[PDB]
Structures are given as C-alpha cells and as structure tokens.
Amino acid sequence: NCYNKFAHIYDKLIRADVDYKKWSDFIIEKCVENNLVFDDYLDLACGTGNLTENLCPKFKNTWAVDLSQEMLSEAENKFRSQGLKPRLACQDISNLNINRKFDLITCCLDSTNYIIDSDDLKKYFKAVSNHLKEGGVFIFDINSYYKLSQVLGNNDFNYDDDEVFYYWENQFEDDLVSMYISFFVRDGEFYKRFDEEHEERAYKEEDIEKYLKHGQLNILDKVDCYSNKKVEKFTERITYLVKLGG
Numbered sequence: 295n296c297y298n299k300f301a302h303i304y305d306k307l308i309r310a311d312v313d314y315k316k317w318s319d320f321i322i323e324k325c326v327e328n329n330l331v332f333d334d335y336l337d338l339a340c341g342t343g344n345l346t347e348n349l350c351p352k353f354k355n356t357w358a359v360d361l362s363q364e365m366l367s368e369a370e371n372k373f374r375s376q377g378l379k380p381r382l383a384c385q386d387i388s389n390l391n392i393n394r395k396f397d398l399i400t401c402c403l404d405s406t407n408y409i410i411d412s413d414d415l416k417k418y419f420k421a422v423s424n425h426l427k428e429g430g431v432f433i434f435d436i437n438s439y440y441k442l443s444q445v446l447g448n449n450d451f452n453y454d455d456d457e458v459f460y461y462w463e464n465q466f467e468d469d470l471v472s473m474y475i476s477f478f479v480r481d482g483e484f485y486k487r488f489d490e491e492h493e494e495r496a497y498k499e500e501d502i503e504k505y506l507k508h509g510q511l512n513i514l515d516k517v518d519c520y521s522n523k524k525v526e527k528f529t530e531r532i533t534y535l536v537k538l539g540g
Contacts, residue, residue, distance in 0.1 A: 296368075297342065297364055297365065297368050298342045298368045298371075298372065300477070300479065300488060301341060301342045301344065301365070301368070302344070303458055303477070303479070304490075305344070305403070307453065307458070307460070308462070308475070309403065309404075311519060311530065311531060312403065314344050314345055314348055315348060316520060317345060317348075317402065317520045318345060318348035318349050320520040320521060320533075321349060321398075321400065321433055321520070322349070322352060324431070324433065324515070324535055325397075325398055325431060328429075328431050328514070328537075329429075330397050330398060330429075330430070330431060331397055332352055332353045332354065332397065332398075333353065333354050333355065333397050334353060334354070334355045334356075334357075334394065334395065334396040334397050334398075334427070335349060335350065335352075335353040335355070335356045335357070335396060335397065335398045335399075335400075336356070336357045336358075336359070336392070336394070336396040336398070336399045336400070336425065337349065337350075337356070337357070337358050337359070337399075337400045337401070338359050338360075338387050338390065338399065338400065338401040338405070338422075338434075339359070339360055339361075339387060339401050339402070339403070339405035340358035340359060340360045340365075340366075340369055341360055341362070341365050341369070341403065342365050342368040342369050342372065343358060343368070343369030343372050343373060345400065345402055345403070346358050346369065346373070346380065347372060347373065347376060347378065349398070349400065350373070350378050350380050351378065353397075353398070355380075355381070356378075356380035356381065357380060357381045357382075357383065357392060357394060357396070358373075358380050358381070358382050358383075359382070359383045359384070359385050359387070359390065359392070360384065361384065361385065361386055361387070362384075363384050366382050366384055369382070370382060387401070387405070387409065387418055387421070388409060388414040388415075388417050388418050388421070389417070389421070390418075390421040390422070390424075390425065392425065394425065395425055395426065395427045395430070396425055396426060396427060396430055397427050397429075397430045397431070398430065398431055398432075398433070399422055399425060399426060399430070399431070399432045399433070400432075400433050400434065401422075401432075401433075401434035401435075402433075402434065402435050403435070404435060404436055404437045404494065404531070405434075406418070406434050406435070406436045406497075407436050407437050407442070407494035407495055407496075407497070408492065408493070408494060409495070410470060410493055410494070410495040412501075412505070415497075415505055416505055416508050416509065418509075419505055419506055419508065419509030419511055420508070420509045420510075422509065422511070423509050423510050423511050423538055426537070426538050428538060429537070429538075430537065430538065431514070431535060431536070431537050432511065432535075432536045432537065433533065433534070433535050433536075434533075434534055435519070435520070435531055435532060435533045435534070436497060436502065436531070436532055436534075437494060437496075437530065437531060438499075438529050438530050438531060438532055439496045439497065439498050439499070440527070440528060440529070440530070441529075441530040441531070442466065442471045442494060442495075442496040443466060443469075443471075443496050445530060446464045446466065446471055446473075447464060447466045447471075448464055448465055448466050449464050450462065450463040450464065451463075456480070457479070457480040458477065458478070458479050458480065459477070459478040459479075459485070460475060460476060460477045460478065461475070461476050462474070462475045463475070466496075469495055469496045469497075470493060470494075470495050470496070471493070471494050471495075471496060472491075472492075472493050473490075473491065473492050473493070473494070474489075474490075474491050475489070475490045475491070476488070476489050476490075477489075477490065499516070499525070499532065502534070506534075506536060507539075510538065510539055510540045511536045511537070511538065511539055512536060512537055512538070512539030513534065513535070513536050514535045514536055514537055515534075515535040516532065516533075516534055516535070517532075517533050517535075518531070518532065518533070519531040519532070519533060520533050521533075
C-alpha cells in the first residue's frame with residue numbers, strides 16, 4: 295500500500311473526477327446491455343489495479359497489463375490479498391502481444407492520451423481489435439481536447455493539505471500537454487518526494503473517431519465521464535464504447 299497509496303492520492307488530487315465503483319458499475323451495466331458473456335476480461339494500463347479489482351471478480355479469466363513493473367507488483371499484491379488470480383504482463387499497449395481474446399477490454403484513467411504519436415495510437419486500436427472476441431466490447435476514456443488545452447493549458451498550481459504537498463506546472467504546446475509534478479508526502483517527522491512528469495496529447499473526437507475506424511472498430515456509444523450523459527462542448531472526460539466492426 296505504498297506506491298498504491300500514492301496512486302490513490304494522485305487520482306484523488308490530480309485527476310479529481312475518478313470514482314472506481316462508479317466507473318466499474320457503469321462498465322458492468324454497459325456489458326449487460328450488450329448481452330456480454332463474462333468469460334474473459336483484459337484491462338490495459340491496469341496501474342495498481344484499482345479498477346481491475348472491481349471488474350476482475352465478475353469474470354472467469356482476467357489479464358492485467360501495464361508498462362510499469364513497479365505498479366504491476368503493487369496490483370499483484372492487492373490481487374493476492376483478495377484471493378484474485380488474474381494473469382499479469384508487462385508490455386507497451388502500442389505493442390500488445392497476448393495470445394488471447396476477450397469479451398471485455400478496458401483502458402481507463404486517460405491512458406490513451408499518453409500515446410502522443412498518432413501512428414502508435416493506430417497500432418494501439420488495431421492491437422485492441424486483434425484481441426476482441428466477436429461480439430466483445432472495448433471501453434476506454436480520454437481527457438477531452440478542451441480539458442488539456444484550456445482547463446489545464448499552462449497553469450501552475452500549489453496544493454498544501456497538512457499531509458500532502460505538491461507543485462504542479464502545466465505546459466501546453468502544439469496539442470501536447472506536459473505536466474511536471476513534485477509531490478511531498480508526510481511520513482511522520484519527514485517527507486518523501488515524488489517527481490512525476492507525464493505527457494498527454496489532446497486528441498479531437500473527430501480524430502479519435504477516424505483512428506477508431508482505421509482499427510476496424512465501430513462506436514457503440516460516446517458519453518460523458520462514465521454515465522449516460524451526452525458529450526458536450528465542455529466535457530472533460532469522454533468515455534468511448536466500441537466493438538469489432540470490420
């Protein structure tokens with residue numbers, strides 16, 4: 295619960311609009327509306343498994359993939375303490391290589407935005423469709439173009455609750471947002487530092503829709519941050535629901 299603890303802090307302070315149960319329930323709900331057979335589940339970019347632990351128990355076989363060895367280990371400890379046994383694999387989403395097909399594939403927490411190269415994003419969607427069972431569903435979200443370009447843009451911010459301190463600087467340029475964040479977490483009489491630096495591309499729904507089709511994937515629904523609400527001009531998080539089209 296160390297890097298796992300930090301992961302919660304991050305999602306609660308930086309993301310701010312994340313609710314595990316809410317999202318997982320929304321996903322299950324959509325799975326049911328699609329007569330899905332809960333046999334095989336794959337969660338890409340599972341991180342420390344905060345979303346996997348909610349959906350994993352609803353399926354027979356689960357696979358969790360993430361590039362961070364550090365995080366995989368955390369998720370593994372979590373899964374274990376919960377009697378969960380999902381198959382793990384450290385791989386880059388752009389080059390997903392798992393000999394297995396699934397009913398449900400998830401990729402949440404704006405992970406898709408980390409693929410800043412349009413080509414790698416195409417490979418990604420193609421990779422995904424190559425792992426979807428016929429009739430299977432693929433659910434993923436992204437930070438909206440408005441969220442990264444306006445709401446984030448170039449705004450530096452300081453936060454100071456008496457247990458966690460952080461300075462977050464945003465640099466927006468040419469559809470790419472660079473985030474530099476220094477965390478200082480309380481650990482008794484001392485603090486431990488955490489420097490996080492991520493880069494996300496601001497993709498337009500028009501571009502995503504095009505890149506999706508390129509992956510032979512069809513859109514089943516496009517909503518506002520895991521809910522039935524429709525996407526609007528100021529939406530900050532878009533949740534896509536797709537399936538194998540061809």
